[PDB]
Amino acid sequence: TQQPIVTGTSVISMKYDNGVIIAADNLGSYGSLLRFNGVERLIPVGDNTVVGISGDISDMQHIERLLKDLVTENAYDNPLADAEEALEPSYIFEYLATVMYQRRSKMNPLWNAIIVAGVQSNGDQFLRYVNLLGVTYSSPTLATGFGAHMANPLLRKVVDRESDIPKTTVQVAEEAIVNAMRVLYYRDARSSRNFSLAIIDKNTGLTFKKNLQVENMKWDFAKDIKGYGTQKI
Amino acid sequence: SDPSSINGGIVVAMTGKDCVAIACDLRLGSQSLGVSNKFEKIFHYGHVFLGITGLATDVTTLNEMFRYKTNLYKLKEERAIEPETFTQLVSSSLYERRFGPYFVGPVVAGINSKSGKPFIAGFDLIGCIDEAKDFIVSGTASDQLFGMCESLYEPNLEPEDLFETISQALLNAADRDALSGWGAVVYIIKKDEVVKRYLKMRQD
Amino acid sequence: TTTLAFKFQHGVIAAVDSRASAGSYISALRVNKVIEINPYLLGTMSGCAADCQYWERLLAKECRLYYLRNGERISVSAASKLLSNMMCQYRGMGLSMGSMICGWDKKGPGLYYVDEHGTRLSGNMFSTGSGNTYAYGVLDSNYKWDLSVEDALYLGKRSILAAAHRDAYSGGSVNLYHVTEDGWIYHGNHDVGELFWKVKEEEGSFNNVIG
Amino acid sequence: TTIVGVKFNNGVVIAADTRSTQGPIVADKNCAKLHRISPKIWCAGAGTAADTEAVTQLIGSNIELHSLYTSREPRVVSALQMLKQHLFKYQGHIGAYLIVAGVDPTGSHLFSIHAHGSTDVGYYLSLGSGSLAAMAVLESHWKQDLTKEEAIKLASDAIQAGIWNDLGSGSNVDVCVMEIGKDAEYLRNYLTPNVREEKQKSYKFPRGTTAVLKESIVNICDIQEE
Amino acid sequence: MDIILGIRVQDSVILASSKAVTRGISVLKDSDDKTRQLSPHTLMSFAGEAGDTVQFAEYIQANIQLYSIREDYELSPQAVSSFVRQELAKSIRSRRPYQVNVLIGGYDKKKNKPELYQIDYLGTKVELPYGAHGYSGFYTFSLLDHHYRPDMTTEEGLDLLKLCVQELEKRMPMDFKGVIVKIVDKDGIRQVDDF
Amino acid sequence: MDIILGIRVQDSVILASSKAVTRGISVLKDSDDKTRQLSPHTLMSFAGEAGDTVQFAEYIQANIQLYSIREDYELSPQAVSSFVRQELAKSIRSRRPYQVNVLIGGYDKKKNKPELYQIDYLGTKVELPYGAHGYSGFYTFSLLDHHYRPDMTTEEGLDLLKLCVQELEKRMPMDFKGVIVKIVDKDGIRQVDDF
Amino acid sequence: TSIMAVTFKDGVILGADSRTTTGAYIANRVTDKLTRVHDKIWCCRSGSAADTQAIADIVQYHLELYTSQYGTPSTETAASVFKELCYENKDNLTAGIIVAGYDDKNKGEVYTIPLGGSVHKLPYAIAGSGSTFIYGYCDKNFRENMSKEETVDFIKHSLSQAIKWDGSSGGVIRMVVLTAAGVERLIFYPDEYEQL
Amino acid sequence: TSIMAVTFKDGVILGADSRTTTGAYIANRVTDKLTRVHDKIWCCRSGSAADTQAIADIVQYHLELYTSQYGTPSTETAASVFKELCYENKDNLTAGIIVAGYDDKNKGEVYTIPLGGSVHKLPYAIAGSGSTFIYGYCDKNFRENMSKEETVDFIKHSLSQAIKWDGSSGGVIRMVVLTAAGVERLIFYPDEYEQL
Amino acid sequence: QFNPYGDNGGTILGIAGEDFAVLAGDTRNITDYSINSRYEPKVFDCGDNIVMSANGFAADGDALVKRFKNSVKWYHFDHNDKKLSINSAARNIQHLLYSRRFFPYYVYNIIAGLDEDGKGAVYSFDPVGSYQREQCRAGGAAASLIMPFLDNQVNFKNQYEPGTNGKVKKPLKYLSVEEVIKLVRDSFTSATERHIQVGDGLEILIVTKDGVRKEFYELKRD
Numbered sequence A: 001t002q003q004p005i006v007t008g009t010s011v012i013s014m015k016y017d018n019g020v021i022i023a024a025d026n027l028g029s030y031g032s033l034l035r036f037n038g039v040e041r042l043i044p045v046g047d048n049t050v051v052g053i054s055g056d057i058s059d060m061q062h063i064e065r066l067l068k069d070l071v072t073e074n075a076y077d078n079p080l081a082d083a084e085e086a087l088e089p090s091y092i093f094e095y096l097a098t099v100m101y102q103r104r105s106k107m108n109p110l111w112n113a114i115i116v117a118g119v120q121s122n123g124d125q126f127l128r129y130v131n132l133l134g135v136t137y138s139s140p141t142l143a144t145g146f147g148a149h150m151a152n153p154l155l156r157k158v159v160d161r162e163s164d165i166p167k168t169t170v171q172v173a174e175e176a177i178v179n180a181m182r183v184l185y186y187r188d189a190r191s192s193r194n195f196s197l198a199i200i201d202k203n204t205g206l207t208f209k210k211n212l213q214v215e216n217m218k219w220d221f222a223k224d225i226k227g228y229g230t231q232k233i
Numbered sequence B: 001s002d003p004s005s006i007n008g009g010i011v012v013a014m015t016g017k018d019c020v021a022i023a024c025d026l027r028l029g030s031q032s033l034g035v036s037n038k039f040e041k042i043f044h045y046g047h048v049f050l051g052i053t054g055l056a057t058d059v060t061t062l063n064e065m066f067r068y069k070t071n072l073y074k075l076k077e078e079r080a081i082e083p084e085t086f087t088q089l090v091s092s093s094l095y096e097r098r099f100g101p102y103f104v105g106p107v108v109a110g111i112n113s114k115s116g117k118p119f120i121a122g123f124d125l126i127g128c129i130d131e132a133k134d135f136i137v138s139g140t141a142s143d144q145l146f147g148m149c150e151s152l153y154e155p156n157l158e159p160e161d162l163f164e165t166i167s168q169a170l171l172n173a174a175d176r177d178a179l180s181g182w183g184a185v186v187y188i189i190k191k192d193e194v195v196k197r198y199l200k201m202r203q204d
Numbered sequence C: 001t002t003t004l005a006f007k008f009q010h011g012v013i014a015a016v017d018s019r020a021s022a023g024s025y026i027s028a029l030r031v032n033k034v035i036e037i038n039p040y041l042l043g044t045m046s047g048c049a050a051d052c053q054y055w056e057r058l059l060a061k062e063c064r065l066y067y068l069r070n071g072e073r074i075s076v077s078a079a080s081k082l083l084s085n086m087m088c089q090y091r092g093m094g095l096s097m098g099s100m101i102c103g104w105d106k107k108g109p110g111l112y113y114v115d116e117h118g119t120r121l122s123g124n125m126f127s128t129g130s131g132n133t134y135a136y137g138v139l140d141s142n143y144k145w146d147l148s149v150e151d152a153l154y155l156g157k158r159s160i161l162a163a164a165h166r167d168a169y170s171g172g173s174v175n176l177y178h179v180t181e182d183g184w185i186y187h188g189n190h191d192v193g194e195l196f197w198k199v200k201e202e203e204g205s206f207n208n209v210i211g
Numbered sequence D: 001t002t003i004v005g006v007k008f009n010n011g012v013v014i015a016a017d018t019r020s021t022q023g024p025i026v027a028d029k030n031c032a033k034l035h036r037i038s039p040k041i042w043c044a045g046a047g048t049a050a051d052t053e054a055v056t057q058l059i060g061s062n063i064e065l066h067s068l069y070t071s072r073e074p075r076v077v078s079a080l081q082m083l084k085q086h087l088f089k090y091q092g093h094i095g096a097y098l099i100v101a102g103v104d105p106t107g108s109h110l111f112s113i114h115a116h117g118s119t120d121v122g123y124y125l126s127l128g129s130g131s132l133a134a135m136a137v138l139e140s141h142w143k144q145d146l147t148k149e150e151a152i153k154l155a156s157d158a159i160q161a162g163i164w165n166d167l168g169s170g171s172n173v174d175v176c177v178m179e180i181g182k183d184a185e186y187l188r189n190y191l192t193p194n195v196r197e198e199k200q201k202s203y204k205f206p207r208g209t210t211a212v213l214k215e216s217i218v219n220i221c222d223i224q225e226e
Numbered sequence E, F: 001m002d003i004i005l006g007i008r009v010q011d012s013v014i015l016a017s018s019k020a021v022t023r024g025i026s027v028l029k030d031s032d033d034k035t036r037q038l039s040p041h042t043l044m045s046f047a048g049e050a051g052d053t054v055q056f057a058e059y060i061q062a063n064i065q066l067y068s069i070r071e072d073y074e075l076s077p078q079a080v081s082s083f084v085r086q087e088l089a090k091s092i093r094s095r096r097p098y099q100v101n102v103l104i105g106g107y108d109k110k111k112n113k114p115e116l117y118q119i120d121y122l123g124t125k126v127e128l129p130y131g132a133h134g135y136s137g138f139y140t141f142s143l144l145d146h147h148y149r150p151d152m153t154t155e156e157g158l159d160l161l162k163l164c165v166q167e168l169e170k171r172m173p174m175d176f177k178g179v180i181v182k183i184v185d186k187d188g189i190r191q192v193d194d195f
Numbered sequence G, H: 001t002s003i004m005a006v007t008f009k010d011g012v013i014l015g016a017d018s019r020t021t022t023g024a025y026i027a028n029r030v031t032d033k034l035t036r037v038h039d040k041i042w043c044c045r046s047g048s049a050a051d052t053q054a055i056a057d058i059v060q061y062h063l064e065l066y067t068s069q070y071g072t073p074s075t076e077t078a079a080s081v082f083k084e085l086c087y088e089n090k091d092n093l094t095a096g097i098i099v100a101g102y103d104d105k106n107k108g109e110v111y112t113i114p115l116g117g118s119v120h121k122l123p124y125a126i127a128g129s130g131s132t133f134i135y136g137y138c139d140k141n142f143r144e145n146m147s148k149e150e151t152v153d154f155i156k157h158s159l160s161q162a163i164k165w166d167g168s169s170g171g172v173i174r175m176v177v178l179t180a181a182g183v184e185r186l187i188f189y190p191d192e193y194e195q196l
Numbered sequence I: 001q002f003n004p005y006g007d008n009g010g011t012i013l014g015i016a017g018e019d020f021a022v023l024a025g026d027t028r029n030i031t032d033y034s035i036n037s038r039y040e041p042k043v044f045d046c047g048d049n050i051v052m053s054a055n056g057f058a059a060d061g062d063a064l065v066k067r068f069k070n071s072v073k074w075y076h077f078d079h080n081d082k083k084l085s086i087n088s089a090a091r092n093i094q095h096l097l098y099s100r101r102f103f104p105y106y107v108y109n110i111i112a113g114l115d116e117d118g119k120g121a122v123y124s125f126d127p128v129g130s131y132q133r134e135q136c137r138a139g140g141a142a143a144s145l146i147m148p149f150l151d152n153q154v155n156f157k158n159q160y161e162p163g164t165n166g167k168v169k170k171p172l173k174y175l176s177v178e179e180v181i182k183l184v185r186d187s188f189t190s191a192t193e194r195h196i197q198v199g200d201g202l203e204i205l206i207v208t209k210d211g212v213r214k215e216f217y218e219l220k221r222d
């Protein structure tokens, strides 16, 4: 049993017609202190999977190393390591899910919430969640922390059920994700303007976008707001 | 320890076509011990009926209080109180003890003597009104009653059909609650006749 | 729960209720609180359902192995002790199990009370569970060694009924057993709802209750 | 509970869902959370339901008497000040969280109020368990110089977000529009997207199914003459 | 204190109350009478926290005696029981509640009927053919459920009561030092000196 | 369990032990024998937490019986008491201690003397002319201090023991359901069937 | 919260962020923490919003009644009323208030009233959860008798850093200028102050 | 405690105060918080002195053994050993360590390891109870590729302010310069840095 | 302090017919007041004509099912591809649950299938392994809402035959699969209305001698 120290906030994601999108800001918070401003919380595994992690950063860095070691180990005595016997999103997820549930069962959890986004061999979209309790679930949209409360409602307006996935393009999905990240910046006190976004498409592969910023923000209306009730000036 | 579950008991009310029904079990207990099988939880002030679940001392106390208040209402107003008005009186009376409440779950049932409109309502222990069209439930088997009422109930039932529906909702909910049962009573209420029926049920 | 068991002239009677609870919620109307360890051994159950089932079925495994090694059926005294020894291993670990081991062996009819503390008591009459006090009232005032099989079965049946009525966490149905030197004999499942009204009329008891 | 308030060109609109809960159980599927303080000052409450009602009726009563005393129409700042001073006095023990909106001779107003007595000002607000889902919609779609029609749409869309995504919120959408120089229009069940489907079977019983012991006539009439 | 029992038969009410009083680990008295006559045809037994029981009983006694003198009239057992209940219901929400449980046995001279009322410290009143407080009912109610008839004589009521005390004496861990039995009927209140 | 008494007279040791066994609010048994014969001339009574008492007593019994067979010789009461003390002193610092208090009554055939040892669950041993555990001594030691002589007969020891039980039965709140009395002398161990 | 009040040559300026949080949720991102108790006596509020609003409302009432009887009150007098409330009700309050005002006689004055209800007259003051991160910056960069433009830059840069590091602080930077000329409100948006 | 490590053109400089407290008592006013784990790999310690000393001693042992087998270790390697100890024993440790070292290949590098056992490579780092008060100052005044004299002034001014506001910080300012030229120790006394 | 347990909501329902059995469950997965998934399968085909659902804490439920599926696999290996009977599966699951008596699987488990005489069978468990064969059982969040309804509509409790007035009970006529599915759908529709953790979707697994069949029905998404 521990407590989280340096933490990362929401990770948000969604399925679209040809793949999945995942995003997460670049902040490492130390309680209310916005301590670290260059933290990458999306970690690619090969060219078909991106693992997005929220929660304790020290445990994230540990998981980051487990995945790096997983790729190394898979290549051992494996002539098809970059082809048929390459790591799949489902393999990577189940490994992490096994680790998370074992650690919680020893009362020494990895204090994280993880979303594994990727595209399988057969072109199928993969999107599944796992956390410190070993709880797992899948949905057309997935989000951790504050993202669950504020991002999912917005992303579910685009893909409300399974049948909406083929009707959703990458431009629409990316737009929804970017808007959600802005909303989180408005309303999450442990979020940052800077974020990373990753798209895993079954045709165009893995596109990893760094140093993205929240833009087109509305603040002008603040000038008119005065006092807390009766004050006019 | 929990005052709302020491004595046990349940109350349910339903609306029908130009009629209402209110029913209650007869048990009074001290936790696991059954004490009385004749503890009726439904009272009436004129043509307005009130069922009360929860802590038995507060049930008794509130009945005596609303009898007191409705008797004065009648002397001054020169008419019997109506269900809508009584509902507000119950709500007012409970909220005046906001920080030292009566541990009860009251349920009002009756027909407006002027409009003829059937009326039921429920409250929490602190006065919040639940004016439902269909049914109201209260007691230690409220979850059980919600499940039974929600599946068995249909609108515009006739008095003799409504009787069967409310009776079966109560009986089967009580038979899945340790703290409810030991007999049951059902009131069938029409604009100018009221029938009261004691049900036969398992005594464990 | 309410369970009882008593020795008498023609063996031992065992009677249990059939309710199960999860707080105020009645989780089961008809659970089997007697285990048929062997044709001449019974075990009653009260407390944690899981504990009762696991440990008494493990006792049956261990009683069966006794027969294979020795070519002879285990005594009631030895069976009760194996069970009490199991309880002593998980001493203070939070088990909840109250049971009577009823049977017939070479010393005649046998009855032992065993609980999670490792207690092991020999006696002519026992009753366990939340409603044991109600059962004891009827048993103590009506019990004799000279009871007939018919009157004895009724006493155990009527004693559970008494508990089912008053105890909120006892009821459902009554399961009767009669243990003889040719083995135990099941005497049926008796719904308390129907039994209550039947007993009320025939016996004249429960006058206060209206029916 | 999900409640919102949205300002627009010539007034203000509030909205709310219609689910009331006791724990995980739904007590009332069509509860009315939009309360009236005065004719053109309406309130919506989250938190302890009895407290939101009682505190609304009390202040509404005093506001009416104040209006009669001063021969003037009640102001939203009066209701606000009276509410916060009452709530502050009870130090949060009266669990009333409200969005207060209305029109008066000064103009259109929109305030939020928290149980401890703090107040806020805004062009768009949300309260309750579904506030975050609703605010996500408001932050995405709200703009300056909204029309009446755009504001009702935004308000109800924000409530729907709460209905679908928050388990504490559900059923229908209530709305009240307060426009300057007009009567306030209360739109009870403005939206009804959660109608229960027809049941597969009727559970109406045969007459005589239930066993009965005694029947008796209940005397509800008074004592008779002669 | 510990055990108080009550039974209403054909023409009387019988109250049985334990004699023991304990402080610390020592039984100070084995002849204590846990009862007060409220009026000539109304008797109240009591059990609960030390000191509170007698203080409450005497306070009730004084109030009923005051009523009797003022009106030159005996209140019905029902009226007395309602007065007592209200005092307990008033008490439970006080700064320091009176932790007292009572049985009220009375003979109504108007209706010519015996009446037994059970009231606990919360103000929970019930009219019963037989009653008890605390753990007493756990042992005795099964016997009473079995043997009780409403047409029983006073002598049959005492015999059924003996059976209840014998069961208590067998299965209760505590020694309550026997009981004092009192009968309430049309002729008033009398004590059974041999039990 | 509740009460265990012991008294050493001229030529014997007498142990008296209560018969009651209680679970919850119900007395399950009123004829329980809270004792084990460790050897032909050594008897141990016991009282403490449920289950632990019998398990401990039987474990001691097995060890002494094992010694008797191995050496074809009966250990002295002093030797047995020391063995028991060490087991309890070992137990008190264990993960889960055995919560058992004992009296060991034995007749030493070598010295031709009766011996009574009192040992509590901590491993606190004392040789005494008379002893008790728990609250039993609070009521009885004043009588024993007054009436006890070392030259008392077995019959006088029983009469003084009756007086102790009568005092317990009067002033203890708990009903311990009488006692089983056993006498340990040169001829061995026997039970007094009428007490 | 990040709040500050700074005296300069022509008077005094109050500055504040606009973020209000309930845990990690931002309940209001455009809060006005600069509150007026008199024409040219304003305060910055920190701590319990309920407590600080209730206090400032009572103070505004006292100073309005003071004015009706005795004329325009001093900034010191305003701070004393705040103090008296904060000190005597310290067991039931969680309020950290900075008082700032302009007289023609006394010119710009700043008083800070921390949790206990003590009063401290200062050239400038900082308070709120975000103030901790700018103690070093403000101490190094503050000068007496700065110009209006210099003082606005000082507050802007300071609160910029407080907002940057404190999660409980953020939104817009509001400022109120108190001089003989009158009362000027200022606002500075993220795109302006973040790039400093 | 107030500790910091800053990279510059020619390498890296570690800086620290010298105060150690037991509550409000100053147990040592001339502490050396700049500790050597290898020739040109040093660390700044914050948190439990017992924990941080025990860790740095173990790290020094590991790097001495590393050197005997594999040659001079990198600063990254040193930080990894610190991390591994801090992370795996996080339940029983209270250690906040800044690691700083000079290679000829990698030049000056700075790693910070806060409470949880995470590692963060930075241009400069600050830590300890006194660091909170200089987040704003250090952010505004830090530049990359400063000169030695500029970097010494930056650390001196920064820790000066941390000491000024933090009661747990104080005494002398110790510094260690890590370059190709070698290892230079510096010290700055109160009379020098207080008047800045 | 770390809490190793959680509540993912949901509700499950098993009914045994004369020659068939059903195991139903909603597809909603939740934490607190949020929805994780509107479609997260909860009832599984475990092989050998057995269906299972472990409802409560999803992590423990998935682990149990995963372990039992594994137990079935090894039963085939060790015992010459013998079919695991429903009674044997039930006993096996008891031991899986009690292996964690002191750190329980936080789930209410139900299995359904056919007994060795071809009749419909449902077995019910508690979190620590007590089990028994039942005709009717609802488990999970809205179990208390649904069970009484089933006592009334499946076992005809408190139902008597008109005219006799409580003297003669309603006879226990068997139910068809079409009739059972109606009671299942009405049970979940009713539970969805009054329970906030129940909704989104309903998945029913029907077991007959022919095999395992699936039926899906939408539920209210509020």
Ligand SMILES: *[C@@]([C])([C][O])[C@](*)(=O)[C]([C]C1=[C][C]=[C][C]=[C]1)[N]C(=O)[C]([C]C1=[C][N]C2=C1[C]=[C][C]=[C]2)[N]C(=O)[C]([C])[N]C(=O)C1=C([C])C2=C([C]1)[C]=[C][C]=[C]2
Binding pocket: C001, C002, C018, C019, C020, C021, C022, C023, C027, C028, C031, C032, C033, C045, C046, C047, C048, C049, C050, C052, C053, C096, C129, C130, C169, C170, I124, I125, I126, I130, I131, I132
């Ligand atoms: C009385 C009815 C209640 O005390 C009796 O003691 C029974 C005994 C019993 C023995 C064997 C089988 C079933 C019951 N006890 C219970 O029903 C216990 C009471 C209890 C609840 N918590 C607790 C108890 C006892 C001791 C410590 C803690 N009830 C249970 O164990 C609950 C958890 N059992 C169930 O919910 C069961 C369900 C559902 C179920 C069961 C048990 C068995 C078969 C199918 C379904």
Ligand SMILES: [Mg+2]
Binding pocket: B174, B175, B176, B177, B178, B179, B180, B181, B182, B204
């Ligand atoms: Mg019941």
Ligand SMILES: [Mg+2]
Binding pocket: B203, B204, C163, C164, C165, C166, C167, C168, C169, C170, C171
């Ligand atoms: Mg019962």
Ligand SMILES: [Mg+2]
Binding pocket: B035, E118, E119, E120, E124, E125, E126
């Ligand atoms: Mg009572």
Ligand SMILES: [Mg+2]
Binding pocket: D091, D116, G048, G050, G051, G092, G093
């Ligand atoms: Mg306050």
Ligand SMILES: [Mg+2]
Binding pocket: A034, G163, G164, G165, G166, G167, G168, G169, G170
């Ligand atoms: Mg910020």
Ligand SMILES: [Mg+2]
Binding pocket: I191, I192, I193, I194, I195, I196, I197, I198, I199, I220, I222
């Ligand atoms: Mg629902």
